[PDB]
Design a protein around this ligand. Structure first.
Ligand SMILES: Cn1ncc(N[C@@H]2CCNC2)c(Cl)c1=O
Length: 119
């Protein structure tokens, strides 16, 4: 589709970045986002950094947005998907963190579709 191709190929503009910030702030404000605001503490999660190859959290994404790290929407989506995929990979499906990942990714997908349509 056009949205698929734009996501992979169209460089993010200044206006795009304002939308990225709105999406990120919406995720940070969500009731289920608190496990993802800051990096996992090793005292909360034995072996976490040895198991998870590419850790990610919303504070790292915020820094990257502020530094204009992302050139394509795909890269932003990839970092966000790391947050949820890492959580579900490390934790069993009955973990409360796994449940938060399910809810918050669903919210992200809704917001992401709105952002793609706006471009
Ligand atoms: C296993 N495990 N442990 C903690 C955590 N979040 C922390 C809680 C408060 N700050 C970050 C996640 Cl996401 C996780 O998967």
């Amino acid at each position: 589709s056009t949205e698929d191709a734009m996501t992979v190929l169209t460089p993010l503009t200044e206006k795009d970045y304002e939308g990225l910030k709105r999406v990120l702030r919406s995720l940070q404000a969500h009731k289920m986002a608190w496990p993802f605001l800051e990096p996992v503490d090793p005292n909360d999660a034995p072996d976490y950094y040895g198991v998870i190859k590419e850790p990610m959290d919303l504070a790292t994404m915020e820094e990257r947005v502020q530094r204009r790290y992302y050139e394509k929407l795909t890269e932003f989506v990839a970092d966000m998907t790391k947050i949820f995929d890492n959580c579900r990979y490390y934790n069993p499906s009955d973990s409360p963190f796994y449940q938060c990942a399910e809810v918050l990714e669903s919210f992200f997908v809704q917001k992401l579709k709105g952002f793609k349509a706006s471009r």
